[PDB]
Design a protein around this ligand. Structure first.
Ligand SMILES: CCCCCCCCCCCCCCCC(=O)OC[C@H](CO[C@@H]1O[C@H](CS(=O)(=O)O)[C@@H](O)[C@H](O)[C@H]1O)OC(=O)CCCCCCCCCCCCCCC
Ligand SMILES: CCCCCCCCCCCCCCCC(=O)OC[C@H](CO[C@@H]1O[C@H](CS(=O)(=O)O)[C@@H](O)[C@H](O)[C@H]1O)OC(=O)CCCCCCCCCCCCCCC
Ligand SMILES: CCCCCCCCCCCCCCCCCC(=O)O[C@@H](COC(=O)CCCCCCCCCCCCCCC)COP(=O)(O)OC[C@H](O)CO
Lengths: 478, 475, 61, 54, 68
């Protein structure tokens, strides 16, 4: 079943060459929608209270390398896969109107890599799909994008390449220090060894996944690669890769070193608090919108680290919910900011003004922008509040000061999103620079669907949590 | 005595004569075929004696085990891939093609003989057979001054390297009484002395010249710019194949593995190769020079296979040496195909090729990414096996340097794909703005590109081959 | 938002938030003096800003 | 205004310096290939008599 | 100059230090018949490949030193 999720985008990518244009777009839509629908069906048949792997597949592939093709989906992994497939469908729907044959190919390859990396119970296979994700996003940042594509793209590449290194350096090592064959996880890979080495391996995994998540000082590719990327590229990159990094960190660094994590929790909580405060205070100063939203992404990913620093059964349901919430909210905000930049032709915070009045000035993307910005900050009725409050309630029994600092970070998030909404939606229109083009009906459909899903999951939040309740128990209570 | 192991070489040898006499009579000939057919027959002659008989020796002067067959087939396949590229290339130049294929096939014969040779005299004769033909091929296009200076430089370096290797061989013959044989020397001298260390270093000095280990590297950047590009394609695949084959057959079997100071020497050379050949390659403007320094770096990668020799490092080395064929033949076929059409130039002129010629771009980017080690592709699994065979032994530092250099290499390998794809109609180079719009070149390009993209995931059939080959290395 | 800090530190102390479990809890409570001082100061500062009180009063003007 | 500036100067720069250094280390080490074959033979001869010492 | 003097000193130390096996038996006077026996019994591969070596050297040298 998972093999379909991995192969269908690969088939579409290999089929984008040697295909006529009209068929090029229609078939890309078809493949993306099929993968998405299959993901939903899998999610329905995901019958819960299992506490074990589901939809498993095992084939021996490369015996002299471990590298068995061993898939399998859990409660931590499946919501992320459904999220990736939804974002892929959206990104394909609002694809680029230029060089649109190497786009659907690369987007489908990227989705294949993400879905594979999530549903892979083999370490070296996970790394295969990780470094597979490495390059097509470089190509997406590079072809489509802004003035400073090249530099930006290069940055991303290297900070991801280095990432791979660390992860690989910490797999091979922890694949040999236990004299185990068959790198596949949930298996003979059993740490059970002396300290002072578990520390080094855990730090390697932290620095290899915290650089993609991204964490506090390892983030310096995110502002450059989100801002110089077209809106579909930004959506896909943010959601897909950020969740890949966070999933990697949680799964591996918590299922393999539970003795070293309990000792590094005290430092990781403070690092996460510093990260939230840092993202907020750095977003407050930015005078370009996409930069504010990128620092929003940093701040919202630091919540996952604060949640994982506490081993609470609640603080992990909260972590998965925060991953899903940040995916949806970042998708919405990047889509809205892309629409604004297209229609208005500028992205600064001192020439944008008055985008909320009915006739002459873009008012349903501004209303959605105010609804996404308040969802990003902690405002009940939307998904961000549910996720953040689960994290807070789970992380207060443990260290209480980093939780308070996280609350202050949420306040500062509200601060800079209000700054952006005031200097973007409120105010008056400049009456020489107006005459924005109209927004066509099937161009604000993705934002209007993301908004409906966000407002739904915030008032009926059970459908955000009922998937990763037993899996989080299996994660932390072990 | 047991001349059966030679029915692989003599076949090619016959072609050398037949693709020569026909050039004496005709002078406008179709020798490109019945030369591809000659190499095909030479390779098909290995199936009868790959598994059917055991390991055999000619007179002690030659051995035909599975490792020998592996390296012989490797060099023959490199020559087969080079013959395809060099048809419309040296024909477009005002030169002959039979007098070039005879030299190429003689270099192939030398490389195939040096693989299974296990005697001092015959080793020297095969190495010099390779080197002379390499000089002649480097200086073939005698109209260009760069080709002549490159041939002179390569000859002056290679002849000195051969003189040093010969001094080492004479010392090795004198230390162990007589015994020009390789295995009869290990039995004679079995203790580290000053003479043995000097012979070892003097042999290494002539090995590293072939496999391009720094500081014995400084000729490839000046030879790859000078030589005809198909000669460079044969020189980066076949010459390294012969050098690594001779290194395995020499160091392991002749220099008594009790004197494993060569593992230290090759650790030094591999560290230095990885560091240099990838850092300096990062600042280059021509594709051939970039590929030269890349080739130095890849030799540095391979040299962590037999520096930790554990029956898995040897297999990792052989697998990467097999995949390197598909990567570099395909990376040089696209370079030739581009420099043929209009360009005849460097990296900066690649800008905007996605619009005019998409097949060349899809073929060159695949091979450059394979060289960089990108997932599913022939290079990713080669490098992963090289790095795990290095951890599984204990060489943390070597592998942790190989990974960082792999990132450094991803940078300048993707910098070319940058030019090939990014550009809009206003940023095409002056060589693409007027890009025009030879069947063997395409049928070799397609084959190497589909091999470098499928020999990664369909790697299990050619892991048993590598393992049965590695079973022959002593330890 | 400081009301959130307050409601967040009243759960480990009272096990609930129902204005009735809190009443029963406050009836029979012997926990630290400064701890409840801080949490009730937060519970104050919430409505203090919501009701336009010093110093959070400029918003009403 | 401090933090952003910090991010724009100290963090970002610290991540770029490495790259820049690796560029310089390649731009001023290509000169090791001097273009003189006698220099190449000197480096080959410096390879020996040093590995012989080590 | 310095690398030459150093390599010569190193080689001289190696030559004066190692205990060669002198094997005090008078050599053979008929040293050409033995070389004739070794061309076709032991060193048959090199004797046969030297012909192709000479042929390829002739071909390549005529090609390089040709006039056109
Ligand atoms: C903060 C709460 C957020 C909830 C609001 C929900 C979003 C609005 C739902 C829209 C339903 C889908 C149809 C919309 C498109 C359409 O019909 O015509 C588009 C035109 C807009 O002008 C048109 O604007 C178009 C540009 S654009 O669409 O506005 O982007 C263009 O067609 C042309 O300019 C112009 O006529 O009509 C509108 O959509 C504007 C009305 C809809 C927006 C209402 C926002 C005003 C309330 C904001 C705050 C709500 C407070 C109450 C409690 C929350
Ligand atoms: C403890 C953790 C939980 C607590 C919550 C976290 C603390 C939040 C405190 C709020 C701090 C204010 C944010 C800084 C705003 C800024 O950057 O520039 C200053 C902005 C202008 O920014 C400008 O805004 C402009 C847009 S706009 O037109 O102004 O809207 C824009 O163009 C310009 O670039 C931008 O600089 O102007 C303001 O100062 C408006 C802020 C008014 C906030 C009221 C105070 C709220 C707290 C109560 C204080 C009680 C105690 C007082 C002393 C007794
Ligand atoms: C300890 C301090 C912490 C503070 C935060 C720092 C943490 C950073 C983590 C480092 C990640 C590596 C970042 C590499 C920077 C690449 C960015 C870059 O710019 O690439 C340059 C070049 O990139 C490279 O050269 C590749 C080589 C980079 C290799 C870096 C590896 C660093 C890893 C450090 C590990 C050290 C080993 C320690 C082990 C004990 C190009 O610069 P440019 O201005 O020209 O860009 C435009 C472009 O050139 C136009 O096309």
């Amino acid at each position: 079943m998972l093999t379909l999720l991995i192969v269908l985008p690969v088939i579409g990518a290999l089929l984008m060459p040697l295909l006529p244009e009209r068929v090029l777009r229609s078939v890309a839509l078809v493949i993306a929608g099929l993968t998405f629908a299959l993901s939903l069906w899998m999610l329905t048949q995901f019958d819960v209270h299992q506490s074990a792997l589901q939809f498993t597949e095992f084939v021996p592939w490369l015996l002299p390398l471990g590298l068995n093709y061993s898939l399998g989906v859990d409660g931590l992994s499946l919501p992320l896969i459904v999220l990736g497939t939804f974002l892929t469908l959206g990104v394909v729907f609002t694809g680029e109107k230029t060089g649109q044959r190497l786009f659907y190919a690369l987007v489908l390859l990227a989705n294949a890599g993400i879905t594979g990396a999530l549903a892979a119970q083999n370490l070296l296979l996970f790394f295969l799909f990780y470094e597979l994700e490495l390059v097509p996003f470089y190509l997406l940042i590079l072809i489509w994008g802004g003035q400073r594509r090249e530099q930006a793209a290069v940055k991303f590449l290297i900070y991801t390449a280095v990432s791979g290194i660390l992860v690989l350096a910490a797999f091979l090592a922890m694949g040999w220090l236990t004299h185990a064959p068959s790198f596949d996880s949930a298996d003979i890979q059993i740490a059970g060894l002396a300290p002072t080495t578990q520390g080094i391996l855990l730090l390697l995994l932290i620095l290899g996944f915290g650089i993609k998540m991204p964490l506090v000082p390892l983030h310096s590719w995110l502002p450059d690669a989100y801002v110089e990327a077209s809106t579909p590229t930004a959506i896909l990159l943010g959601g897909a890769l950020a969740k890949l990094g966070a999933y990697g960190l949680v799964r591996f660094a918590l299922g393999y070193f539970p003795e070293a994590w309990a000792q590094f929790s005290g430092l990781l909580a403070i690092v996460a608090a510093v990260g939230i405060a840092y993202g907020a205070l750095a977003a407050i100063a930015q005078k370009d919108i996409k930069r504010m939203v990128a620092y929003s992404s940093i701040g919202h990913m630091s919540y996952v680290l604060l949640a994982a620093a506490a081993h609470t059964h609640l603080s992990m349901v909260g972590a998965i919910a925060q991953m899903i919430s940040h995916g949806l909210i970042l998708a919405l905000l990047f889509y809205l900011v892309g629409v604004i930049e297209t229609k208005v032709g500028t992205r600064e915070l001192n020439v944008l003004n008055g985008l909320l009045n009915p006739l002459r000035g873009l008012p349903t993307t501004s209303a959605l922008l105010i609804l996404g910005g308040m969802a990003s900050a902690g405002i009940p009725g939307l998904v961000g509040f549910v996720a953040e409050f689960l994290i807070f309630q789970g992380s207060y029994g443990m260290f209480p000061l980093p939780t308070l600092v996280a609350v202050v970070g949420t306040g500062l998030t509200a601060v800079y999103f209000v700054i952006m909404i005031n200097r973007t939606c409120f105010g008056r229109l400049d009456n020489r620079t107006a005459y924005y083009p109209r927004v066509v009906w099937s161009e604000k459909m993705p934002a209007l669907v993301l908004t409906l899903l966000i407002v739904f999951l915030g008032v009926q939040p059970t459908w955000l949590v009922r998937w990763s309740e037993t899996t989080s128990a299996q994660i932390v209570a072990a | 005595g047991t001349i059966l192991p030679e029915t692989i070489l003599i076949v090619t040898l016959l072609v050398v004569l037949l693709a020569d006499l026909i050039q004496g009579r005709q002078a406008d000939r179709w020798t490109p075929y019945f030369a591809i057919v000659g190499l095909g027959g030479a390779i098909a002659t290995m199936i009868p004696l790959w598994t059917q008989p055991a390991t055999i020796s000619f007179f002690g002067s030659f051995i035909s085990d599975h490792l020998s067959l592996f390296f012989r087939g490797l060099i023959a396949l490199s020559a087969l891939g080079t013959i395809l590229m060099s048809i419309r290339y040296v024909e477009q130049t005002g030169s002959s093609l039979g007098e070039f294929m005879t030299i190429l096939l003689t270099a192939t014969v030398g490389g195939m003989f040096i693989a299974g040779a296990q005697e001092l005299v015959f080793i020297f004769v095969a190495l010099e057979t390779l080197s002379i033909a390499s000089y002649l091929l480097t200086g073939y296009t005698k109209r260009d001054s760069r080709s002549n200076e490159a041939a002179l430089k390569y000859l002056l370096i290679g002849a000195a390297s051969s003189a040093i290797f010969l001094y080492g061989s004479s010392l090795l013959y004198g230390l162990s009484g007589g015994h020009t044989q390789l295995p009869a020397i290990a039995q004679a001298l079995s203790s580290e002395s000053l003479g043995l260390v000097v012979a070892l270093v003097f042999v290494i000095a002539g090995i590293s010249f072939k496999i391009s280990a720094v500081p014995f590297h400084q000729w490839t950047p000046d030879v790859y710019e000078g030589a005809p590009t198909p000669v460079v394609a044969f020189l980066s695949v076949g010459s390294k194949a012969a050098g690594f084959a001779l290194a395995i057959r020499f160091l392991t079997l002749a220099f008594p593995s009790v004197t494993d100071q060569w593992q230290l020497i090759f650790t030094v050379l591999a560290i230095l190769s990885m560091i240099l050949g990838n850092v300096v390659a990062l600042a280059q403007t021509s594709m051939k020079r970039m590929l030269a320094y890349s080739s130095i770096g890849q030799a540095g990668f391979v040299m962590i296979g037999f520096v930790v020799g554990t029956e898995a490092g040897y297999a990792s080395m052989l697998f990467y040496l097999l995949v390197y064929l598909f990567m570099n033949l395909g990376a040089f076929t696209c370079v030739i195909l581009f420099s043929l059409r209009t360009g005849t130039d460097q990296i900066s002129e690649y800008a905007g090729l996605y619009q005019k010629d998409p097949l060349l771009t899809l073929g060159l980017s695949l091979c450059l990414l394979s060289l960089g080690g990108i997932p599913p592709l022939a290079g990713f699994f080669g490098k992963i096996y090289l790095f795990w065979a290095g951890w599984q032994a204990g060489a943390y530092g070597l592998v942790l340097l190989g990974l960082l250099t792999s990132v450094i290499s991803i940078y300048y390998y993707i910098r070319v794909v940058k030019m090939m794809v990014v550009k809009e109609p206003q940023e095409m180079s002056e060589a693409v703005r007027n890009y025009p719009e030879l069947r063997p070149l395409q049928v070799g390009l397609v084959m190497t590109v589909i091999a470098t993209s499928l020999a990664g995931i369909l790697a299990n059939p050619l892991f048993n081959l590598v393992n049965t080959a590695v079973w022959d290395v002593p330890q | 938002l400081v009301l959130l800090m307050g409601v967040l530190a009243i759960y480990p102390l009272a096990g609930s938030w129902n204005y009735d479990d809190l009443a029963a809890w406050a009836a029979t409570a012997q926990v630290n003096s400064t701890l409840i001082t801080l949490i009730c100061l937060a519970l104050i500062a919430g409505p203090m800003g919501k009701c336009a009180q010093f110093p959070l009063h400029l918003w009403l003007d | 205004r401090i933090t952003a500036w910090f991010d724009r100067t100290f963090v970002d720069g610290t991540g770029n310096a490495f790259g820049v250094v690796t560029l310089l280390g390649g731009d001023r080490l290509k000169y090791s290939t001097t273009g003189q074959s006698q220099a190449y033979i000197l480096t080959i001869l410096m390879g020996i008599a040093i590995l012989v010492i080590a | 100059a310095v690398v030459s003097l150093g390599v010569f000193a190193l080689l001289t130390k190696m030559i004066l230090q190692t205990p060669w096996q002198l094997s005090s038996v008078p050599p053979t006077p008929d040293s050409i018949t033995t070389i004739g026996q070794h061309f076709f019994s032991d060193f048959l591969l090199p004797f046969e490949l030297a012909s192709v070596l000479l042929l390829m050297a002739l071909i390549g040298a005529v090609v390089l030193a040709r006039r056109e």
